Amino acid sequence: NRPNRLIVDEAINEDNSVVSLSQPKMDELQLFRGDTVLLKGKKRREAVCIVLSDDTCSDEKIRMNRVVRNNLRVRLGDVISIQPCPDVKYGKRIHVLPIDDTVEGITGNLFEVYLKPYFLEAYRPIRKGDIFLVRGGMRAVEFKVVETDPSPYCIVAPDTVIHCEGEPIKREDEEESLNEVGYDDIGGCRKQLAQIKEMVELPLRHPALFKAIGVKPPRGILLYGPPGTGKTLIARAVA
Amino acid sequence: NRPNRLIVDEAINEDNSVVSLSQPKMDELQLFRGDTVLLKGKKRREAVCIVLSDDTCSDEKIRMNRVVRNNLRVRLGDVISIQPCPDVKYGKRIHVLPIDDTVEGITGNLFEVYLKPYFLEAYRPIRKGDIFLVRGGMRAVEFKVVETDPSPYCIVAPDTVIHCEGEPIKREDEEESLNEVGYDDIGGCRKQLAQIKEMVELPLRHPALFKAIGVKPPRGILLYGPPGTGKTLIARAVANETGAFFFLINGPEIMSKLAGESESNLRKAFEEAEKNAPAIIFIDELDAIAPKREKTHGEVERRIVSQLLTLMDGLKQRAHVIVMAATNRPNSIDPALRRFGRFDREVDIGIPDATGRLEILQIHTKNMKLADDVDLEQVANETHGHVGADLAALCSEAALQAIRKKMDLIDLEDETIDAEVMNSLAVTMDDFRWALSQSNPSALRETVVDVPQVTWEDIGGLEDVKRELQELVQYPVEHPDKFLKFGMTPSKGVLFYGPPGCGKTLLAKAIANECQANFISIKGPELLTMWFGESEANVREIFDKARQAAPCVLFFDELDSIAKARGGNIGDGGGAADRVINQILTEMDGMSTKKNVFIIGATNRPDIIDPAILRPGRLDQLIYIPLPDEKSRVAILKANLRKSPVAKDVDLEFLAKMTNGFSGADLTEICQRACKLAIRESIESEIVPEIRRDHFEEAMRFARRSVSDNDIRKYEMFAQTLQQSRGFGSFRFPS
Ligand SMILES: Nc1ncnc2c1ncn2[C@@H]1O[C@H](COP(=O)(O)OP(=O)(O)O)[C@@H](O)[C@H]1O
Ligand SMILES: Nc1ncnc2c1ncn2[C@@H]1O[C@H](COP(=O)(O)OP(=O)(O)O)[C@@H](O)[C@H]1O
Ligand SMILES: Nc1ncnc2c1ncn2[C@@H]1O[C@H](COP(=O)(O)OP(=O)(O)O)[C@@H](O)[C@H]1O
Numbered sequence: 001n002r003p004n005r006l007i008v009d010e011a012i013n014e015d016n017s018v019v020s021l022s023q024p025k026m027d028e029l030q031l032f033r034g035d036t037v038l039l040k041g042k043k044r045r046e047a048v049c050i051v052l053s054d055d056t057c058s059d060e061k062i063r064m065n066r067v068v069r070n071n072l073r074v075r076l077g078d079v080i081s082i083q084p085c086p087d088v089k090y091g092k093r094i095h096v097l098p099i100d101d102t103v104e105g106i107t108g109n110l111f112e113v114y115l116k117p118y119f120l121e122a123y124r125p126i127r128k129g130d131i132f133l134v135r136g137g138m139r140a141v142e143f144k145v146v147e148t149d150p151s152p153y154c155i156v157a158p159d160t161v162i163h164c165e166g167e168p169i170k171r172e173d174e175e176e177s178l179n180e181v182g183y184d185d186i187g188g189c190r191k192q193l194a195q196i197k198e199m200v201e202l203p204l205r206h207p208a209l210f211k212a213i214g215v216k217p218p219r220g221i222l223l224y225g226p227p228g229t230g231k232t233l234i235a236r237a238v239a
Numbered sequence: 240n241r242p243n244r245l246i247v248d249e250a251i252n253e254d255n256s257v258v259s260l261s262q263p264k265m266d267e268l269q270l271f272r273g274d275t276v277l278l279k280g281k282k283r284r285e286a287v288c289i290v291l292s293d294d295t296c297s298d299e300k301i302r303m304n305r306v307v308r309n310n311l312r313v314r315l316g317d318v319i320s321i322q323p324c325p326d327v328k329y330g331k332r333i334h335v336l337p338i339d340d341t342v343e344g345i346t347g348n349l350f351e352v353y354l355k356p357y358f359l360e361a362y363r364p365i366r367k368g369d370i371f372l373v374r375g376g377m378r379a380v381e382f383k384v385v386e387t388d389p390s391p392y393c394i395v396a397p398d399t400v401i402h403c404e405g406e407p408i409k410r411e412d413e414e415e416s417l418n419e420v421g422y423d424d425i426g427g428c429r430k431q432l433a434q435i436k437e438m439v440e441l442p443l444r445h446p447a448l449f450k451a452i453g454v455k456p457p458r459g460i461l462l463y464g465p466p467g468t469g470k471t472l473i474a475r476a477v478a479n480e481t482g483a484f485f486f487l488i489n490g491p492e493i494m495s496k497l498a499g500e501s502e503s504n505l506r507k508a509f510e511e512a513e514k515n516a517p518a519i520i521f522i523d524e525l526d527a528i529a530p531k532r533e534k535t536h537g538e539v540e541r542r543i544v545s546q547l548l549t550l551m552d553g554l555k556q557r558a559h560v561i562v563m564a565a566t567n568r569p570n571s572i573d574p575a576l577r578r579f580g581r582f583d584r585e586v587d588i589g590i591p592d593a594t595g596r597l598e599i600l601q602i603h604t605k606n607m608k609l610a611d612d613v614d615l616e617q618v619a620n621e622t623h624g625h626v627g628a629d630l631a632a633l634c635s636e637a638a639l640q641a642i643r644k645k646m647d648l649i650d651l652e653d654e655t656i657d658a659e660v661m662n663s664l665a666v667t668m669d670d671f672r673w674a675l676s677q678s679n680p681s682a683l684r685e686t687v688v689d690v691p692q693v694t695w696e697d698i699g700g701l702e703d704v705k706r707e708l709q710e711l712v713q714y715p716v717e718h719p720d721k722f723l724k725f726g727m728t729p730s731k732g733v734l735f736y737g738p739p740g741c742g743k744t745l746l747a748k749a750i751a752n753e754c755q756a757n758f759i760s761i762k763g764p765e766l767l768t769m770w771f772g773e774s775e776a777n778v779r780e781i782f783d784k785a786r787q788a789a790p791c792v793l794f795f796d797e798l799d800s801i802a803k804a805r806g807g808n809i810g811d812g813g814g815a816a817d818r819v820i821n822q823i824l825t826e827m828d829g830m831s832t833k834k835n836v837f838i839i840g841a842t843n844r845p846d847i848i849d850p851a852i853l854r855p856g857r858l859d860q861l862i863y864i865p866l867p868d869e870k871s872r873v874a875i876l877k878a879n880l881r882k883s884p885v886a887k888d889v890d891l892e893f894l895a896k897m898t899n900g901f902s903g904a905d906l907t908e909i910c911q912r913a914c915k916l917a918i919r920e921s922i923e924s925e926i927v928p929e930i931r932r933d934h935f936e937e938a939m940r941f942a943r944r945s946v947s948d949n950d951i952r953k954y955e956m957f958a959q960t961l962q963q964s965r966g967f968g969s970f971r972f973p974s
Contacts, residue, residue: 007650060648079650198643209642212344212656214378214606215635 003028005081006062008074010183013065016132017124019051020063026053031084036125036155039064041072041080048085048125066182070175071130076183076197077205089125089153091160098143100168102179106141114141115162125155133178142178144169181237186230193234196221200238242267244320245301247313249422252304253605255371256363258290259302265292270323275364275394278303280311280319287324287364305421309414310369315422315436315480316444328364328392330399337382339407341418345380347657353380354401364394372417376662377607377638381417383408420476425469426602427595427627431588435460435477438584439561443481443517446559458554459582461572462565465682467628468588470565474521483561484515490524498539505546513558522564531573544573551581570780587787590626590682592689593619599630607638610665618671624683636674641666686781688757688788691748698745699878699903700871704862708733708750711860712837716754716790730860731827732793732838734852736845737864738946738954740904743841746864747794756790756835763800766819770801775818782826790835795823798840802847815849827857845957863958866951867903869895875903879910888932900944900951912938 011020019037026033031051039047049068057063062082074080103110114134126132128151133142146169148154171177186193203210203217210217223231250259258276265272270290278286288307296302301321313319342349353373365371367390372381385408387393410416425432442449442456449456462470471487478485488508493501512518522528529544554560564582566572576582591599597619604615622630641664651660695705715722715729722729735743744760751758761781769775785791801819805811827838840858842848852858867875872895880891898906913934921927 005650007648079652202639202642208344208654209656213661215638217639 004083005079006060008069008076008078008080009057009061009063010076011063011065013052016065016067017049017122018065019049020054020057021051022054022057022059025060026051029082029084031086036085038083038085039072039080040083041074041078043073045072045129046127047072047130048127050124066184067131067133067178070178071127073174073176075205077201085152087153089155091149091155091157093149094126094145094154094156094160094162095148095164096143096145096162097164097166098141098168099171101171101177102139102141103168110164111162113137119156123155123157127151128154131175131178140179181233183237185233185237189230189234196234196238243322244318245299247308247315247317247319248296248300248302249315250302250304252291253601255304255306256288256361257304258288259293259296260290261293261296261298264299265290268321268323270325275324277322277324278311278319279322280313280317282312284311284368285366286311286369287366289363305423306370306372306417309417310366312413312415314444314482316440324391326392328394330388330394330396332388333365333384333393333395333399333401334387334403335382335384335401336403336405337380337407338410340410340416341378341380342407344655345658346655347659349403349658350401352376352658352662358395362394362396366390367393370414370417374606375608376658377664378661379418379606415479419479420472422476422480424472424476424602426598427591428469428473428588431586432473435473435586439477439481439519442559442561443483443519446517449559450556456559456561457584458562458580459551459576460561460563460584460586461582462563462586462588463569464567464588465590465626465685466567467626467681468590469627470588471521471523473588474519474563474565478519478521481517481519484512484518486512486518486520488520488522490522490527493543494527501539501543502546505543505550509550509554509560512560516558516560518558518560520560520562522562525564525566526568526571529573529576530571531575532571544575548575548581551576585787587784589688589788590624593623596622596625596627596630599627600634603631603634608662608665610667613667613671618675621675622678622680624680624687625678626680626682629678629680633671633674633678636677637666637671640670640673644670686759686761686784688759688784688791690756691752691758693745693748694752695749697878697881698742698749699873699875700867701742701746701864704746704864705749707862708746709753712750712792713754716835728832731832731856732840732858733860733862734840734842734858735862735864736842736848738866738902738950739843740902740945741864741867742903743864744794744796747792747839747841750839751792754790754792756792757785757788758792758794759785759788760794761796763797766795766798766800767804770804770817770819775822778819778822779826782823782830785836786830786834791837793836793838794841795839796841797843799842799844799847802849803844807844807847810847815847816851820849820852824851824857846953861961863954865954865958866900872898872901872906875906876910879907883914883930885930886932889930889935894935900946900948901942902944902946905943905945909935909938909942912941 011018013020019039031037033051033053035051036048037051039049041047047068049064054063062080069075072080098110114136117136118134126145128145128148131142131144133140135141199218199221223234225231250257252259258278270276272290272292274290275287276290278288280286286307288303293302301319308314311319337349353375356375357373365384367384367387370381370383372379374380438457438460462473464470475485486508488505493504496504508520512520529547531541531544534540551562554562569585569587572582597615600615600618618633622633625633645664651657698705711730711733735746737743747760748758759781769777782793785793798820801817802810802815805813805817830836838858840852853861873891876891876894880889914930916934916937917930
C-alpha cells in the first residue's frame with residue numbers, strides 16, 4: 001500500500017518548523033531524530049523541515065503546523081508523501097524581503113529586530129519560495145524568499161549573512177494569507193470542535209463522494225453559547 | 240364468473256419475484272408449488288414469477304410485490320388474470336444493462352458485484368422487457384432487459400453467461416421510477432393506514448362511480464401526529480400508488496410571496512389539478528397558514544385563511560380531486576376549517592412501538608448490508624422516545640461513521656468511487672452504538688400511547704382479581720347481544736384501592752394486552768401539574784386522544800395525589816373537591832358509552848377519595864387488592880426471576896415464609912440488590928457467570944418494608960365496613 005504517505009493533522013507545538021511523529025512511526029522509515037525530512041504533497045511544491053518525537057498522536061499520521069501548510073498549498077484531511085534526505089547542505093547567499101501588507105508602518109533596521117532572534121541556534125532548512133511568519137514586536141510579520149542560490153542545498157548557517165534591499169513586493173491569490181483565522185485560534189473547545197470537524201470534513205473535502213451515494217448529509221448546523229464565545233470564529237476557521 | 244381473475248395486494252415478503260397465494264386457493268388451479276406462473280393484466284404486457292404459499296391472506300386474492308407491479312403497469316385495487324404455464328424453458332443468450340439514473344458514480348466491474356449474488360440458486364423466469372431492482376452496495380440499483388432471445392422460453396440458468404457493453408440508455412415516462420415512495424415504505428402504521436386506503440381507493444380508482452351516483456365522497460383528510468412521523472410520506476405514497484396527480488403546497492412557500500401573489504397561487508393551484516383528474520392536493524403545514532387562534536394580527540393572514548376556506552367548500556363536484564392536509568398540533572386549527580364539507584375526516588398517527596420501529600429500521604436499511612452480529616431487535620428497545628424520522632437520521636449517521644473509521648487511512652484520491660469496496664463496507668454494533676449516543680430525540684414531552692407486552696404470566700398471584708377484570712371488559716365487547724337483549728348498560732370503569740406496592744399498574748397494563756387495545760397511563764405528578772399550573776383544560780386533550788385511538792384503556796395512577804398535597808388525612812379549610820377532578824367528572828358524563836374505551840383508577844388512600852366519583856354513572860366497580868399470601872409470593876418471585884437465568888439451589892419457597900408484610904414491590908428491590916452483588920463480585924474478581932445462593936442471604940439485611948403496620952388495619956376495617964355481608968346468612972322459602 002506504499003507505506004510512505006501519511007495524513008496531515010494540526011500541530012500541538014507553537015514552533016514554526018516542527019514535524020511531530022511517533023516513536024513506532026519513526027523507525028518504519030529507518031531514520032534518525034535530529035535531521036531534515038523532505039515532504040512532497042501536491043501542486044509540485046516541496047517542503048523540508050525538522051522532525052520531532054511524539055508519543056500520543058496516533059497509529060499513523062503526521063502533525064504539521066499552519067505556516068508550513070501554506071507552502072505546500074495543502075489543507076486538513078489531505079494525504080502527503082514523506083521521504084528522507086540525509087545529505088549535508090549549507091548556505092552561501094540568502095536574499096529575502098517581506099510583503100508590504102505586514103510591514104506597513106515600520107521603520108528602522110529590519111535585521112537585528114526580526115532576523116537575528118529567529119535563526120540563532122535553529123538550523124532550519126529554509127527552502128526557496130517558502131513563506132514563514134515571525135512573531136515579535138507585539139505584531140505579526142511574515143517574510144518570503146524571492147531568489148537565492150538554486151534549491152536544493154540551502155540551509156541557513158551562521159557563516160552566511162543576510163541582505164535586504166528595502167522595497168516590498170505584491171502578493172497574489174495563489175498563497176493564503178496567514179493573518180486569517182485557523183484551527184490554532186481555538187482554545188478550550190476540544191470535545192465540541194471535533195464534532196464540527198468530523199461533520200464537515202466528508203461533505204466538503206470529497207464533494208463527489210456524496211454526489212454518487214444516496215446518503216443525506218446534514219444541512220443545518222446551529223450554534224449555541226453566550227455572545228463572545230467565538231461562534232463566528234469557528235465558522236470562519238472551518239471554512 | 241370466470242374464476243381465474245384475482246385482485247392484487249401488497250406483498251409481505253422482501254423478495255422480488257415472489258407471488259403469495261393461499262393453500263385453498265392453490266388447488267383451485269390444480270397446480271404444484273415449485274413452478275412458474277404466468278400473469279396477464281392489462282396494456283398487453285405479461286409477467287411470469289414464482290408462486291409461494293400463504294395461510295392468512297384472504298379468501299381469494301393475489302399478493303405481489305412493488306417491483307413486479309411496474310412491469311405490468313398495474314396498481315393496487317386492479318384485477319389481473321392468472322394462468323399456469325407448465326413448460327420447461329432454459330436460457331441461452333442474455334443481454335441486460337442498467338439505466339444511468341442509478342449507476343451514476345459507479346465504476347469497476349458490474350458483474351461480480353450485482354449480477355452474481357442475485358441469480359445464484361434462484362431460477363427466476365426473467366421475461367423480456369421486465370424491470371427489476373437489485374439491493375446491495377448500500378445503494379439502490381435497477382436494471383432492464385433490452386434485447387435477448389425471443390420471449391417466451393427464457394429462464395436464467397448457470398449454463399448461460401451474462402455480457403454487458405457499458406453504455407446506459409434513456410428512460411421514458413411509460414415506466415414508473417422505483418426510487419419513488421410506495422406502500423412498502425410505511426412501518427408500524429397498520430390500523431390507521433387502512434382507513435386512508437379504504438377512504439381513497441373508491442373515489443380515485445373509479446372516478447365514474449361517484450360521478451353517476453349522488454353519494455358525497457369525503458373531501459378533506461386532515462392528518463395529525465408529531466413532526467417526523469411521515470405525514471408527507473403517506474400523502475405521496477397514496478398518490479403514487481393510485482395513479483393520481485400529486486400537488487404539494489408548502490406552508491412557508493405561500494407566506495414568502497408578496498401581497499396578492501400569495502392569493503393567486505392558492506387559486507391557481509386548484510384548476511391546475513382539476514384538469515388532471517383524479518388528483519390529490521396536499522398541504523405541508525397548517526400552523527403557518529391558518530393560526531387564527533390568538534394571533535388577531537396581520538391583514539393578509541386573514542385574507543389567505545378566507546381564500547383557503549372558500550377554495551375548500553367551493554369544490555362543487557366537477558372534478559374528482561381529494562384535498563389533504565397535515566398538522567402536527569391538533570389544537571392549532573381554526574374551527575372554521577373543521578366544519579362539515581371542508582375537514583370532516585381526522586387521522587391521528589402516533590409514535591410507533593418497538594415492533595413498528597423495527598420495520599422502520601428494516602425499511603431504511605434494505606439497500607445496505609449488515610454483519611451477522613448485527614440485530615435490529617435490540618436497537619428498537621432503547622429508542623422508545625424516537626420518531627420515525629429519528630431512525631432515518633440514526634441509520635444515516637451509523638452508515639456515515641463507518642466511512643470515517645474504515646475509509647480514513649485509505650485516501651483513494653480518485654474522481655469517482657468504485658463498487659468493489661463500497662459493497663464490502665459492513666456496519667457493526669460499534670457504528671450503531673456511537674450513533675445512539677449522538678442522537679437527540681425531539682419528542683419526549685408528549686403523551687405516548689403504547690400496548691404493553693406484560694401478560695398475566697408476569698403477575699404472581701391475585702388470581703381472584705384477574706377473573707373479575709376479565710369478566711367485566713371482555714364480555715360486553717364480544718357478547719353485545721346478551722347486553723342489548725336485556726337492555727342493561729355495561730360498567731363505565733373500575734377503581735383499584737389498597738396498600739401501595741401490590742402492583743395496581745400491572746393489573747391495568749395486563750388487561751390492555753389481552754384485549755388487543757391501546758393503553759394510556761397518567762402518573763401522579765401529571766395531575767398535580769395542572770392543579771399547580773391553574774390550567775385544568777389540558778385533560779380535555781387527554782380524553783380526546785383516547786377516543787380516536789379506539790380501542791383503548793385509560794389509567795389514572797394515585798388519583799388521591801392532589802388530596803395529599805392539600806393536607807391529606809387532616810385536609811384543609813375546604814372539602815375534598817378540586818379543579819383537576821372536576822374536569823374529569825364533567826368529561827366522563829359527556830363521553831359516549833358505546834365506544835371501546837375503559838377507565839381504570841388507581842389509589843392507595845381510599846379515605847381521602849372524593850365521594851362524588853362513586854355515584855352510579857361514573858365509577859361504581861371498586862376492586863380491592865389485599866396483601867399477598869404465602870402461596871402467592873412464590874409466583875411473584877418466579878415471574879420476576881424470568882428475565883435473568885438463576886441457579887437451582889435458590890429455594891424461593893423458604894423466602895416466601897418469613898415474608899409477612901412484604902408487598903409485591905417489596906420483593907423487587909431484594910432481587911435487584913442480590914443481582915448487584917453478582918456484578919460487583921464478578922468485576923472485583925475479574926482482575927462465576929451465575930447468581931449464587933449467598934447473594935440473597937446478604938440482601939436480607941436490607942429488607943425494608945415500604946408499608947407500615949398501623950395502616951394495615953385501616954384497610955381491613957374499611958373493607959369490612961364496605962362489604963358488611965353479615966346478618967342474612969342463608970334464607971329459604973317454605974315452598
Ligand atoms: N474562544 C476564542 N478564542 C479566541 N478568540 C476569540 C474566542 N472567542 C472570541 N474571540 C475573539 O473575539 C472577537 C469577537 O468575537 P465575536 O464575533 O463576538 O464572537 P461571537 O460571534 O461568537 O459572539 C473575535 O475577533 C475573536 O478573535
Ligand atoms: N414512518 C416512516 N417510515 C419511513 N420513513 C419515514 C417515516 N417517517 C419519516 N420518514 C422519513 O423521514 C423523512 C422526513 O419526513 P418528514 O417530511 O419530516 O415527515 P412529516 O412531514 O410527516 O414530518 C422522509 O424522507 C421519510 O423518508
Ligand atoms: N403482584 C406482583 N407480581 C409481580 N410483580 C409485582 C407485583 N406487584 C408489584 N410488582 C413489581 O413491583 C414494581 C413496582 O410496582 P409499583 O409501581 O409499586 O406498583 P403500584 O403502583 O401498584 O404500587 C413493578 O415493577 C412490578 O414489576
